[PDB]
Amino acid sequence: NYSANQYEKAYLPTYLQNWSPARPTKEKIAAHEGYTQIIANDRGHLLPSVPRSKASPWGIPPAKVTLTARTTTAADNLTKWIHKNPDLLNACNGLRPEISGKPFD
Amino acid sequence: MREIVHLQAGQCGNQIGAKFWEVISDEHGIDPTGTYHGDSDLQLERINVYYNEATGGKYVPRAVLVDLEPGTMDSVRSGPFGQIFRPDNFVFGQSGAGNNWAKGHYTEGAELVDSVLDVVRKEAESCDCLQGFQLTHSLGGGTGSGMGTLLISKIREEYPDRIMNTFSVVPSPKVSDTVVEPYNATLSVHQLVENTDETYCIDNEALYDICFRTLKLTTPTYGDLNHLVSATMSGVTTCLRFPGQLNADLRKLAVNMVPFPRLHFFMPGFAPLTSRGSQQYRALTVPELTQQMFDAKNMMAACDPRHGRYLTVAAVFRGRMSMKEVDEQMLNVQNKNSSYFVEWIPNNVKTAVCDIPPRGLKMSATFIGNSTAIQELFKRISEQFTAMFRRKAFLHWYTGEGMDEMEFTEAESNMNDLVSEYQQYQD
Amino acid sequence: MREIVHLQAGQCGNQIGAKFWEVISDEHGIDPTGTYHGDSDLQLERINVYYNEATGGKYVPRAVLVDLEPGTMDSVRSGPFGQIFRPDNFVFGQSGAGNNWAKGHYTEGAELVDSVLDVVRKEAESCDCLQGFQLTHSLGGGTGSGMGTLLISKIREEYPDRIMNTFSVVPSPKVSDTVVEPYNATLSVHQLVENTDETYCIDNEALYDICFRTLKLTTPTYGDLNHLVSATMSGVTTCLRFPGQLNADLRKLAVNMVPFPRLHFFMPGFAPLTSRGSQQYRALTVPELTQQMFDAKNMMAACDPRHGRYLTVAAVFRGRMSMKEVDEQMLNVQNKNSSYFVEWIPNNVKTAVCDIPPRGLKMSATFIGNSTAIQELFKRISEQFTAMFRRKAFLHWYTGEGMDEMEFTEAESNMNDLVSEYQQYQD
Amino acid sequence: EPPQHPRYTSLFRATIKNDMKKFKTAMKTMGP
Amino acid sequence: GCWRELLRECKEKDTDKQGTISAAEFLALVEKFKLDISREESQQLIVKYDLKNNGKFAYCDFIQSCVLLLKAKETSLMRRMRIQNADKMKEAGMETPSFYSALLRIQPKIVHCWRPMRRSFKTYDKNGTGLLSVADFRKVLRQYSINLSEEEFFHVLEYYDKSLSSKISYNDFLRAFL
Amino acid sequence: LPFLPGNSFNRNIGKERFHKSQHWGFCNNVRMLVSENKPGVGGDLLYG
Amino acid sequence: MRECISIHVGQAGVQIGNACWELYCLEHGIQPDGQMPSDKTIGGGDDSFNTFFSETGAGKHVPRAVFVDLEPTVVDEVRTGTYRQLFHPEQLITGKEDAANNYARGHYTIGKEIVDLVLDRIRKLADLCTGLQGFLIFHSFGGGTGSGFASLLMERLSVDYGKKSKLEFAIYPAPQVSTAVVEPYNSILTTHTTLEHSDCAFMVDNEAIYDICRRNLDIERPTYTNLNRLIGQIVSSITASLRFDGALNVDLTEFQTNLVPYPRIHFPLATYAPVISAEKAYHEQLSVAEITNACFEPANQMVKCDPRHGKYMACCMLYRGDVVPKDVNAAIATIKTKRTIQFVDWCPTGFKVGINYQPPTVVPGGDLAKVQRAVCMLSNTTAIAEAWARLDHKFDLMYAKRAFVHWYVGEGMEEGEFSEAREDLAALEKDYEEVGVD
Numbered sequence A: 001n002y003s004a005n006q007y008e009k010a011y012l013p014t015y016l017q018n019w020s021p022a023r024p025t026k027e028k029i030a031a032h033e034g035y036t037q038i039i040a041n042d043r044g045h046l047l048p049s050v051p052r053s054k055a056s057p058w059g060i061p062p063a064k065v066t067l068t069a070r071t072t073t074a075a076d077n078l079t080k081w082i083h084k085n086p087d088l089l090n091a092c093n094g095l096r097p098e099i100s101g102k103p104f105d
Numbered sequence B, C: 001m002r003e004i005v006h007l008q009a010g011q012c013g014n015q016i017g018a019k020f021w022e023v024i025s026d027e028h029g030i031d032p033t034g035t036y037h038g039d040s041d042l043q044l045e046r047i048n049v050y051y052n053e054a055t056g057g058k059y060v061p062r063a064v065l066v067d068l069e070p071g072t073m074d075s076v077r078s079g080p081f082g083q084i085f086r087p088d089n090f091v092f093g094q095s096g097a098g099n100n101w102a103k104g105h106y107t108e109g110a111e112l113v114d115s116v117l118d119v120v121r122k123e124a125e126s127c128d129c130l131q132g133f134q135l136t137h138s139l140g141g142g143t144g145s146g147m148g149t150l151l152i153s154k155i156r157e158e159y160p161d162r163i164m165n166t167f168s169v170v171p172s173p174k175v176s177d178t179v180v181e182p183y184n185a186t187l188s189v190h191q192l193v194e195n196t197d198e199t200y201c202i203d204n205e206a207l208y209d210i211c212f213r214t215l216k217l218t219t220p221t222y223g224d225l226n227h228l229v230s231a232t233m234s235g236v237t238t239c240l241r242f243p244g245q246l247n248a249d250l251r252k253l254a255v256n257m258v259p260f261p262r263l264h265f266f267m268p269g270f271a272p273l274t275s276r277g278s279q280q281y282r283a284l285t286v287p288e289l290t291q292q293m294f295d296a297k298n299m300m301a302a303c304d305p306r307h308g309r310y311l312t313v314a315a316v317f318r319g320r321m322s323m324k325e326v327d328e329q330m331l332n333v334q335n336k337n338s339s340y341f342v343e344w345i346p347n348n349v350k351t352a353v354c355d356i357p358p359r360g361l362k363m364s365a366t367f368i369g370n371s372t373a374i375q376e377l378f379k380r381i382s383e384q385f386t387a388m389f390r391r392k393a394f395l396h397w398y399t400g401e402g403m404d405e406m407e408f409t410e411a412e413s414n415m416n417d418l419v420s421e422y423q424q425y426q427d
Numbered sequence D: 001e002p003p004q005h006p007r008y009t010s011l012f013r014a015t016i017k018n019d020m021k022k023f024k025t026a027m028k029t030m031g032p
Numbered sequence E: 001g002c003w004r005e006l007l008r009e010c011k012e013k014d015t016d017k018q019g020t021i022s023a024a025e026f027l028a029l030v031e032k033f034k035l036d037i038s039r040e041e042s043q044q045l046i047v048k049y050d051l052k053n054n055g056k057f058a059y060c061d062f063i064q065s066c067v068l069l070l071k072a073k074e075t076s077l078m079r080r081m082r083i084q085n086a087d088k089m090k091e092a093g094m095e096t097p098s099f100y101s102a103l104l105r106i107q108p109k110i111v112h113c114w115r116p117m118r119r120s121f122k123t124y125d126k127n128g129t130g131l132l133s134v135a136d137f138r139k140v141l142r143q144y145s146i147n148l149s150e151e152e153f154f155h156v157l158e159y160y161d162k163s164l165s166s167k168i169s170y171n172d173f174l175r176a177f178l
Numbered sequence F: 001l002p003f004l005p006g007n008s009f010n011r012n013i014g015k016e017r018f019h020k021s022q023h024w025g026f027c028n029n030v031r032m033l034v035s036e037n038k039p040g041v042g043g044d045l046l047y048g
Numbered sequence G: 001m002r003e004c005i006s007i008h009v010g011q012a013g014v015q016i017g018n019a020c021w022e023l024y025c026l027e028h029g030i031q032p033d034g035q036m037p038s039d040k041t042i043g044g045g046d047d048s049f050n051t052f053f054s055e056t057g058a059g060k061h062v063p064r065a066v067f068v069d070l071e072p073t074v075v076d077e078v079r080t081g082t083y084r085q086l087f088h089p090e091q092l093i094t095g096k097e098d099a100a101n102n103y104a105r106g107h108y109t110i111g112k113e114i115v116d117l118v119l120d121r122i123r124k125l126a127d128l129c130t131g132l133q134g135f136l137i138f139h140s141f142g143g144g145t146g147s148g149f150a151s152l153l154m155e156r157l158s159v160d161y162g163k164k165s166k167l168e169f170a171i172y173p174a175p176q177v178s179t180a181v182v183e184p185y186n187s188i189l190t191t192h193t194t195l196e197h198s199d200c201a202f203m204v205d206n207e208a209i210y211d212i213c214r215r216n217l218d219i220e221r222p223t224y225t226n227l228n229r230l231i232g233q234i235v236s237s238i239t240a241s242l243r244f245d246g247a248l249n250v251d252l253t254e255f256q257t258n259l260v261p262y263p264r265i266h267f268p269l270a271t272y273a274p275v276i277s278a279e280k281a282y283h284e285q286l287s288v289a290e291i292t293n294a295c296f297e298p299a300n301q302m303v304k305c306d307p308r309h310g311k312y313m314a315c316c317m318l319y320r321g322d323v324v325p326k327d328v329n330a331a332i333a334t335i336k337t338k339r340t341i342q343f344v345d346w347c348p349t350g351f352k353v354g355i356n357y358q359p360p361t362v363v364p365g366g367d368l369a370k371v372q373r374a375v376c377m378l379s380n381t382t383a384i385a386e387a388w389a390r391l392d393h394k395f396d397l398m399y400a401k402r403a404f405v406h407w408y409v410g411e412g413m414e415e416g417e418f419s420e421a422r423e424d425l426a427a428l429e430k431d432y433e434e435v436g437v438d
């Protein structure tokens, strides 16, 4: 799930025709010291001590908009009319749009 | 006189050698049957470096095929030059690999190493005085890692005075097919760094990119991938077989190439790769050769040391050249590319010229590089183990084979060393 | 030896270089296939100023084509001289632009500047010593403005020692078709005045009126407009390629042209333009040449300098002329309108004579002018920006790309500073 | 104990050491 | 200098083995260099180390226990942690870094190139199975510039051996400094 | 054309028969090549 | 050499085996008599059949499978079929009494006195064979005779032979269709008995087989012949690596070592992408990209599971036909970028590619398409626990009111075995949850 090196043009949505960006990637790591012990028994059963992402994942009004210049009261509502929807903010292909704009005077 | 005996290991090496050996025979002009057609005296004279003599003008290759799967060796035997290969040299086993490093390293290797050592020593006694040995296999290869790591260890005590050339291909970083493929690598490279003196590192993704970049032909054969690496490995051997004012010994090369013992991993470089129109749209001159020789695209091994810096560089030029164009281009590439190299060592350029051009092109060359671009490789190699040995996935097999988690720990600690070594020396 | 590498930018320059290069090939007598037909020697030695050598007597143009819309290049590649252009030099993008400056300057150029820099430095190293670079593009041209402003910002720090010629066409004052066109212009000119050393100013409306005036052929092709202008840059380049007692270096010219650093914008002038019947109703004499050479109707760049006064003037004469006729004609014009000059500098005339006439006409000349006629140009756009930045029409796109009005505020007074400057020196 | 001979700077340290580094436009040229 | 300076801090003081350094004058080292130890911790230290080897503060344990001594394992590869248990369990000459002042001398050498000396041991065909001849252990030491004296030898024999010759395992030696 | 890299053009025309045989085998308790007469991939003739 | 033995237990598992052998003879051109034309492929039994048939100097291709059944009805019918002369009479094991859907009746009552005869068959087949990579076990969990009789034999063959593989194939119980209410009883009985011995068990569901039949094959009224034709193709595809070569060759040992992450669970799911009607194949085009999406399209999986509710561990694709490395490696790269595909983070790599040059052919009087590019998609995901979870509440309710127990305790069991299987199952779901907990 890392991004490759140098020849960074042969794998892009240019060929995927992807209209929701795949996944953030990187080329970096802190030098990992560590014996890389085993904290499973036979099943990936974490030894009760070691922590994990403790049952976090287990298994329409939002839209890309620039606030630009539309009346602030409407603009204020839109921001709320975008957010407060974790059913479309969190996971399962990403579910998170973008936003832009500028205020009024 | 001094000769080289070859070892064919793993199924890739089965495809590698088949293309490599047909290149040599066709380069030297021997027919598929084996009756050499006398056309060049120099290739007539310097055939003894690699081949022995059979009756009726037959040049027996001094290579050894080892495998486990008959179909691969059945296929290559039916291949264009299986006839010039020896059933005496066809050694293999009665077992299936499972792509298992441990089975080919402790279980299956035990009963076959005896025979293969007999075969090579019979070949070793057949010849007079070897430079050393070269080895075609894969580091991610399931059984080639199994056999070679065993064999290289045994040869180390057998002949610790010869050249242990190793030719291995790095599997695709983005795509590995085999999932235990990383595990096989660290198992192998742990002994490899201990035993090898030379190691070529090659990756298929660049090969796809180069076929993309210059072959232009969309859909190649994997044999074409063999066909180009066979050309590269042949170029370094042109020095030995061919005349011209160039010193050819790999030790000659290695002592100029290896500043410190742990340096075994090297990247190749080759000469004109030409497109359909550019054959007649190219003015074949050493400068544009020198430009193409040093191209961020012309490389094929891992990636550009654009990330890092240059430690040692050695370029061999095959064809009708002169000492000045290489010198001024070296001066050109010196003044143009000076401080990217480590200030540790200046003038670490190593040049040799083979006056004898290849059969098909005249102005040609080969480059071998040792720069600071291998960090990303074993850095890449580093994470997945820490990811998968984190939870010992697919491990009950190797414990069943009699292996322990501990053996991995020194192997990774050994590579954890070499990350710092590559880092600390350059950075 | 001193040479030049050309740059094709924007889809306007897509017409230009094709027309620009074909004139040169016909001038030097190279067939469409590319095999030179030795007929004139002087073109045979002095072709290396712009061309390199390809095999079989083929002269490869040293120009770089870049764009985004594939259909443009395919038409150019299918043109009568697309074959002489290199697939290697064909660099482009996987996107359509939308004729948006910020996308072509921040979004799409990101992954192409790397490639184009490699190609040019490959070409730059392919040659020994350049005078500099010349660029065909437009200030009102979307993708060209995005690409060119990026590279001119780049090609300065690597090579701050060379001639950074820029050839840009000004859009039609009455209508710009594109409505965001001024937004593209203000951004481009802001970097342009900072980065360039030379800038040509060209307008199409004058070309349309000239067709009504001397061409008299009602309906031309826009290629004819390209063919007309290509003569203009040809003449200024005839200095370098041809012998004759005229000093050719554009720096030699530019130092004689540029009194103060921010003077980048110059107007051209061309020689005999002849109508339907007047070819043999014209007595080709330097007086009437000089007369027509200095005609407000013969002006073609932006508008009449009749509104202002004359800073610097330079006319290059191509053909069998001599020291005398250019002198008294210069004396005649000096006495003709002595007050129309600026009292700041007298004798602001700079003369060069090319003894080698073109192939098609004997008596010819090329004029480059720097007068006080650019005020109307940026004054005209000034009200447009104030009117349309008054309430930010069509601006949500650029903020979507990431733009904000501070860049507009900074750019505008740069132009306003030049308004006061261009006013202050003369008025 | 042999004292190391004071390394005679017949230029060098001044020039030829700095001359090698000065005629160098590297860290720049193939690409970033 | 958590290893070097703190070592040098004691080497400034001079007394005999049992009389390590007076707790009051070790507080004079506290004013010679302010210590990260909390004031309450500072008070116990002068009396939690004077309990052994006279009212003199026992830097003998303190200095080495803080940095030199680590008689355990780790999660994070303390530069090797090979698995091994040969020479430490017996240990007739139980840990006494005053008697075993060689540990104070050798850690500088091993913090330099612990990995090559870690490499050095297995290079002697140790088979990766345990111990290795003592005389072979003697020659590996000096050969890598680790000059260790005969009296220092006698000590480490008492420490890394109990009954007879034995063959002192590699990591079992290593983990002392490691 | 020579056998240079990039000049290898495989016979990629209609290839409907692809049978494989077992040229080698084991037999008894030693190992050798089973009877020489063997067709190749899709019934291919051997060398001479 | 490279050969294996097939076993078909249960009169449910026999007709599917016949169709497989019926399929096999076509690609080899086997005449029903047992002999080739005057063309030369006979000998000591060494050609493409040497892994499948035994055509000795007698000249008759002998299939390397043993058919076992407890009722004489259907088993004699194939003995009166068209290829019965090919088959070995007492390889086609029959029985005179049934197990009446009872696992234990086939496991205890009759199974004792028949396995010894069967054990004679395997050893007399073991002596003649050379390579013996593994076995092909065709059964059914809700087996009237498939369930119980298989359990005893797999136990006995496991203990005497534990150095070789064994491949299990059973119809998975229909999630919402039940032809027997005792079918769950023995199904959990079968699962708990097989968890500690079986190597690789592959399940399939007929409802989705019918579902695809009218979806793209557009047959509203197919038959078993078509149903057996599909699964016979499936096992044919996996045996192409055996029967042919390709760009790379793989073996069952590579499968087992790489498909199963951890012990117990060895339950992958099969999928075959180029399943399309003849006309829909006629005026359309096939390539790796679209068939990769279709095999990854969730409704193309043969088991009633939503991958979006689960997460992927193993994925295996077998490309049989005309393909090239370039598109496939580029294609599979796209899926690695895909977001819906939720592999478990433990495996950056979870894909096993097999390339075979041979295009799959059509069967005369068949219903398949004209396949040039083929792929069999074998994968393992966490979305499987629902089926067992469906069984347990189905199982627990009837156990709570102990329905039909008086038969089983009547003919010789007690609740202890029924007790044990549930926490064996209860272990699975929590283990399936814990492994799903990455």
Ligand SMILES: Nc1nc2c(ncn2[C@@H]2O[C@H](COP(=O)(O)OP(=O)(O)OP(=O)(O)O)[C@@H](O)[C@H]2O)c(=O)[nH]1
Pocket (backbone or CB within 6 Å): B009, B010, B011, B012, B013, B014, B015, B097, B098, B099, B100, B137, B138, B140, B141, B142, B143, B144, B145, B146, B177, B178, B222, G247
């Ligand atoms: N021959 C061959 N090998 C390939 C090709 N593409 C990738 N490889 C890899 O190259 C490796 C080298 O093959 P071998 O060294 O003979 O492998 P092995 O030890 O016999 O066992 P496996 O790796 O499981 O095949 C293989 O493991 C393949 O994964 C190819 O096109 N041809």
Ligand SMILES: Nc1nc2c(ncn2[C@@H]2O[C@H](COP(=O)(O)OP(=O)(O)OP(=O)(O)O)[C@@H](O)[C@H]2O)c(=O)[nH]1
Pocket (backbone or CB within 6 Å): C009, C010, C011, C012, C013, C014, C015, C097, C098, C099, C100, C137, C138, C140, C141, C142, C143, C144, C145, C146, C178, C222
């Ligand atoms: N090629 C071509 N360009 C023309 C023609 N007439 C006007 N032009 C102008 O030349 C300008 C410069 O072209 P480019 O710099 O390549 O423009 P661009 O960056 O592709 O984006 P746009 O200006 O929006 O087209 C364009 O904006 C056109 O308005 C014509 O007949 N042919």
Ligand SMILES: Nc1nc2c(ncn2[C@@H]2O[C@H](COP(=O)(O)OP(=O)(O)OP(=O)(O)O)[C@@H](O)[C@H]2O)c(=O)[nH]1
Pocket (backbone or CB within 6 Å): G009, G010, G011, G012, G013, G014, G015, G016, G071, G098, G100, G101, G139, G140, G142, G143, G144, G145, G146, G147, G171, G179, G180, G224
């Ligand atoms: N394997 C297989 N299963 C089938 C077939 N047709 C239907 N089935 C299903 O498989 C189940 C057959 O199991 P059983 O009835 O226990 O078969 P058995 O153990 O051999 O004994 P019988 O009662 O005689 O059939 C039925 O419930 C059907 O739902 C088929 O052709 N093959």
